[PDB]
Design a protein around this ligand. Structure first.
Ligand SMILES: Nc1ncnc2c1ncn2[C@@H]1O[C@H](COP(=O)(O)OP(=O)(O)NP(=O)(O)O)[C@@H](O)[C@H]1O
Ligand SMILES: Nc1ncnc2c1ncn2[C@@H]1O[C@H](COP(=O)(O)OP(=O)(O)NP(=O)(O)O)[C@@H](O)[C@H]1O
Ligand SMILES: Nc1ccn([C@@H]2O[C@H](COP(=O)(O)OP(=O)(O)O)[C@@H](O)[C@H]2O)c(=O)n1
Ligand SMILES: Nc1ccn([C@@H]2O[C@H](COP(=O)(O)OP(=O)(O)O)[C@@H](O)[C@H]2O)c(=O)n1
Ligand SMILES: [Mg+2]
Ligand SMILES: [Mg+2]
Lengths: 666, 666
């Protein structure tokens, strides 16, 4: 169909752009801001000198054919926010952006540079947007998220923290900020008859700084996620922070509430029992432990009159309300996250990030950071048997995941850190996050319904391979540069890998025993490797479905129909106008369509037609090979208090870390 | 009349309170917060030990009769916000508050303590509210205002500054904050295609922190004043910040805009000429000079295309609009303030304070502070000739002003400083601010219309004496403790006193030559002594008219009629119900009342009936004995663009520093 608008706008772009890469780096580097007279380079000194000392090798390495791998919407995304502009006009071709990104990561290892270039240009993998924006640029802030500790229960602590979010928000990246330690409404303050205002008014300050620190282009999200434990006395308002009605002095519409849930809360809800709310000042230490230690300390404070008791299910019901209307708060299980983190030698983890996938340690003086990349799952499909059936090439997937791991690991050293808390932190533990995109495609291309036994297996299979790969790559790194600073004492140091903490045998596609031997011997370079993220933008750049979720509709959206569906409907000579209309009219749903094979109706279920138990199951299956966590969106058809209840508890009992990211509805 | 409700509620208070002072200090000191279990003392260790080591001397010094010096509204003010409360109930009697304040200032100089006590209990003078609140208490923040420098044109500078206002707003005191150095809307920012948002959105952040840092009781005002020079490119919005209509993202209703006006602006308005707006980044140095140096540098930048030119009177007209509707921006003349400051050896002064009276030097690392007290002008009236006419006792006024000066000077050393910038600053230059209240009364009691030749003279006379006194006291201090750190190089070091900088001979009631001799010889302890403030609350505590303004109505307000008026109307046997009604119905105006002597109509003009030229004149007369500045409110009857125009220019040409504080209307 109109894949023809892609080619047009692509070679239009070729016409408005200098072909030779090294000339473009000259242009971008030499740039002066006409309106102001200021020399405003867009390449670093470092990457400039590199390109100049290697210009023939580099220019000739670039294959411009590989520009036509982009769908129309992929390309318009690139154009509109990614390709570097000279004075309003676009100056970078897609190949130049990639080549720049390759250099920004690799520096003088031109061999590494050429390997990344090739693999990216061919669509094997892609790095997260901040890397695509800033690698090879003079303030190269390439990380996607910062996990910030509230420094202290004081105006000074609060305003130091506010300063840090502000300094972070100048640049690319999202912020997860935990606040369990701020005293609740009405608590005593020494030196006044004044009472405390609590969380909400302090939230309104943060929300306001989110709105003010724009102007980083549109590279900042302008939103923070905030993490709270449900025992905090300010909980009812906190969860209603994105509510669309009620008083305005109580809402904070540019921020996301995220719950940090102890298992105790859930038991109490299930047991239909009491829940007690404390101010952190009448209940110290509560966020600084978990599991049993928490259970013991909580129960004691609860017996010692230190707080306020109400019915667990009163809170529970309010949460489901807030979630049904707004899609938030997110739900992340504190204990599951801490019980099963390779970072537990550092102390208690107090939050996740803005997309509920990063599970790293943060403290007033260490603000945890992470660099993300995603693998293009469908690129490892081949027909390779001999005949008609397609298989999945796991060798290449292991090979490619080792490359990404090495990339992400360099990005740590060549990263610009907005705040000293992020450099201190990331240099010590060197966490890393790999993800995937196009899981739904992979299945579709391989003729598998999402809810099949075969899909369940491949899910496990793929993730086993990425995790094995990354730990292998990381361990090779530890052999060249030493383990990361804080590796002694870690579960990985004691031979305990992620699935072990889930008390499971690995699916056994790869030799874990060899790997585990070498890790106890040599260490790893990275405390953490795996955390599948939303890929909202980058999967649009590679033309794939986000992430690891099924299609939302088969009507993608001018509106363009799912190419695999189209393919199949045409090959069955049943694609007419009745088809174009039935699918528009049902929004990319093909069930209940008179003349369509059952094989296709299974294959092209939309996420609303797939059962959430299956969804949670696959999240549980893959989770044992996930160092950190993943952004589990949930989708509900005709939503009810009961259906939502069984979904949290289902994931909760599965041992999940992120029980829910967004709740999406209608 | 109902002065009888005073006695009732006074001796009611006696019944609910322990008579003996040292028991009350015990009570207050020993206080424990029942709800929380926390020991919450309300007296310092230091003042406790003092009282205990001197309890008989102290308790017996206290005259409780002196509790009945308070009008009903004076007393209700004391009760409602000043007298220390034990668990909701009032624990301090007025005499205890005073005695505490005396100690908090004097420490172990019990002789000084007893002298202050006596003088205050008898209503000779009073210190500003923060002193009344906090002297003798464990965080004794006794200063009324902080003049804060915007630290830098950066997110870091801005958020360091935000932190400092927040830390200051926890406690008593107002903030004047100058921002001439923040780049305006649309300016370049290096490292993004992002433009700057300018002032307004950054103001909204400050306004929001004003709202959030309450809870210091109601001792913080919850408002800042912001100072800008009218060449700043963000000027039109900045002046409209308290506008009651229009868009909400453009207003900031809890802050006050104050203009810092160069003479150039005014000439240009008068000449009907061009005015040029710059961003500080395209015009550096502009706020860091004045007079000629400014004129030269401004003109050059204006010739070099560096900014945007429009008609002076376009801005002028908008200012008058904003002022007519909202009463702001305030108007303070930058050049007059800098030309005539004894602090010019330190560098350019960049703002005043929240009440337009403090004119002190502030810089990113020095935040200027000031401690205020006011003299009760009417307390120095006596009949003392022999017969019927009353005179004014200037000897006692010189004597009392020397006492206050010594008090204020101790408060500097025993002050708690919220931020290190304020301690650095105040310890070096030791500024001080004395004021007055009850000028209108004094005149009334002395049978003088405000606009008489006799009133004009006494105005000059009083102020000459306070200024002479304070410099004398201060110079005696310099003899015991040395001059203040930065006295060398000051105008006062070169024999140049305030009136000299106005190029005037002093009225000559006191020997200035002797004083001036001694100052060049020994120095002063205080860089600055005099800055008449609004006395909004404390004059209500002493039962006098604020400040140095005339009565606003003769219907004070249950509604209580002006006691002097009443006195006089009754003595003429013309006070009936027709009288009670004519004055209610005219809101304390007595002109155009059929049966009232002309002598009384002159004597009891309301500030709306008095001409503003006279008002400005007296402000000009007194200003030559004012180190710093004063809070000139203006009052306009039937306000018009022309009348307001001639008033600014009139004061501007008089050489005033504060041309206008509030513009008050109807
Ligand atoms: N003036 C204020 N306005 C609003 N909230 C305040 C204020 N002062 C303190 N708080 C809140 O109370 C907490 C303590 O503030 P902090 O700056 O530690 O004051 P403090 O004098 O140290 N009182 P305390 O912490 O009780 O010893 C912080 O969480 C503040 O948010
Ligand atoms: N991300 C942002 N959002 C809004 N305003 C900003 C942002 N970054 C900078 N500014 C404004 O631009 C000014 C410069 O900010 P600063 O923190 O100095 O950034 P910088 O990288 O140093 N850019 P420059 O000052 O041009 O070298 C400050 O007045 C900020 O208010
Ligand atoms: N323009 C953008 C988009 C995302 N991000 C960051 O990455 C997160 C979104 O993750 P994602 O994986 O869905 O987005 P992409 O990496 O595909 O653009 C946001 O929460 C931010 O933390 C950013 O900094 N700037
Ligand atoms: N309750 C109060 C009242 C005034 N003030 C400070 O003193 C200023 C008012 O000056 P003023 O002389 O009119 O008030 P008083 O000293 O008479 O209470 C305010 O701008 C604040 O700077 C305060 O800190 N707390
Ligand atoms: Mg504290
Ligand atoms: Mg800067």
């Amino acid at each position: 169909y109109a894949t023809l608008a892609a080619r047009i706008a692509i070679s239009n772009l070729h016409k408005q752009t200098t072909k030779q890469f090294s000339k473009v780096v000259e242009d971008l580097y030499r740039y002066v801001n006409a309106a102001t007279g200021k020399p405003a380079p867009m390449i670093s000194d470092d990457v400039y000198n590199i390109v100049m000392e290697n210009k023939d090798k580099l220019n000739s390495a670039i294959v411009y054919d590989r520009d036509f791998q982009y769908s129309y919407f992929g390309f318009k995304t690139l154009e509109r926010s990614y390709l570097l502009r000279i004075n309003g006009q676009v100056a970078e071709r897609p190949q130049h952006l990639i080549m720049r990104v390759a250099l920004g990561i690799h520096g003088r290892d031109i061999e590494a540079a050429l390997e990344t270039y090739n693999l990216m240009s061919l669509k094997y993998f892609t790095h997260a947007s901040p890397t695509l924006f800033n690698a090879g640029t003079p303030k190269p802030q390439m990380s996607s998220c910062f996990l910030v500790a509230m420094k202290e229960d004081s105006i000074e602590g609060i305003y130091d923290t506010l300063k840090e979010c502000a300094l972070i928000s100048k640049t690319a990246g999202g912020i997860g900020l935990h606040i369990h330690n701020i005293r609740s409404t009405g608590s005593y303050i020494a030196g006044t008859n004044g009472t405390s205002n609590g969380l909400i008014p302090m939230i309104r300050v943060f929300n306001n700084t989110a709105r003010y620190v724009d102007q980083g282009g549109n590279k900042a999200p302008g939103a923070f996620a905030l993490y709270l434990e449900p025992w905090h006395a300010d909980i009812f308002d906190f969860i209603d922070i994105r509510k669309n009605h009620g008083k305005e002095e109580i809402r904070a519409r540019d921020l996301f509430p995220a719950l940090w849930i102890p298992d105790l809360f859930m038991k109490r809800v299930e047991e239909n029992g009491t829940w007690t709310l404390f101010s952190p000042t009448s209940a110290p230490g509560l966020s600084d432990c978990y599991g049993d230690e928490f259970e013991a300390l909580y129960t004691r404070y609860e017996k010692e009159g230190r707080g306020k008791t109400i019915k667990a299910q009163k809170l529970w019901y309010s949460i489901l309300e807030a979630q049904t209307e707004t899609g938030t708060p997110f739900v992340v299980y504190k204990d599951a996250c801490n019980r099963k983190s390779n970072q537990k030698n550092l102390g208690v983890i107090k939050s996740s990030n803005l997309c509920c996938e990063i599970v790293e340690y943060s403290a007033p003086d260490e603000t945890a950071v992470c660099n993300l990349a995603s693998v293009a799952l469908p690129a490892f499909i081949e027909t390779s048997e001999d005949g008609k059936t397609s298989t999945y090439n796991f060798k290449k997937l292991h090979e490619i995941a080792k490359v990404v791991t090495r990339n992400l690991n360099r990005v740590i050293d060549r990263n610009y850190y907005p705040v000293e808390e992020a450099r201190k932190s990331n240099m010590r533990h060197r966490p890393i996050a790999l993800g995937v995109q196009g899981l739904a495609d992979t299945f579709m291309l391989l003729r598998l319904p999402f809810d099949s036994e075969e899909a369940r297996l491949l899910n496990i299979q793929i993730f086993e391979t990425i995790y094995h790969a990354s730990m292998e790559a990381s361990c090779e790194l530890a052999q060249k540069d030493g383990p990361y600073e804080t590796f002694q004492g870690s579960p990985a140091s004691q031979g305990i890998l992620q699935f072990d903490m889930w008390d499971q045998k690995p699916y056994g596609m790869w030799d874990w025993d060899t790997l585990r031997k070498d890790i106890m011997k040599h260490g790893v370079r990275n405390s953490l490797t795996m955390a599948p993220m939303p890929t909202a933008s980058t999967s649009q750049i590679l033309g794939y479905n986000e992430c690891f979720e099924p299609v939302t509709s088969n009507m993608y959206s001018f509106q363009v129909v799912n190419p695999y569906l189209l393919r199949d409907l045409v090959d069955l000579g049943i694609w007419d106008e009745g088809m174009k209309q039935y699918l528009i009219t049902q929004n990319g749903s093909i069930q209940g369509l008179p003349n369509v094979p059952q094989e296709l109706k299974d294959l092209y279920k939309t996420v609303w037609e797939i059962s959430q138990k299956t969804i949670i199951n696959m999240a549980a299956d893959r989770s044992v090979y996930i160092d950190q966590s993943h952004s589990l969106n949930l989708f509900l058809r005709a939503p009810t208090m009961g259906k939502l209840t069984s979904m949290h508890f289902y994931g909760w009992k599965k041992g999940l870390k992120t029980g829910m990211y967004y709740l999406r509805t209608q």
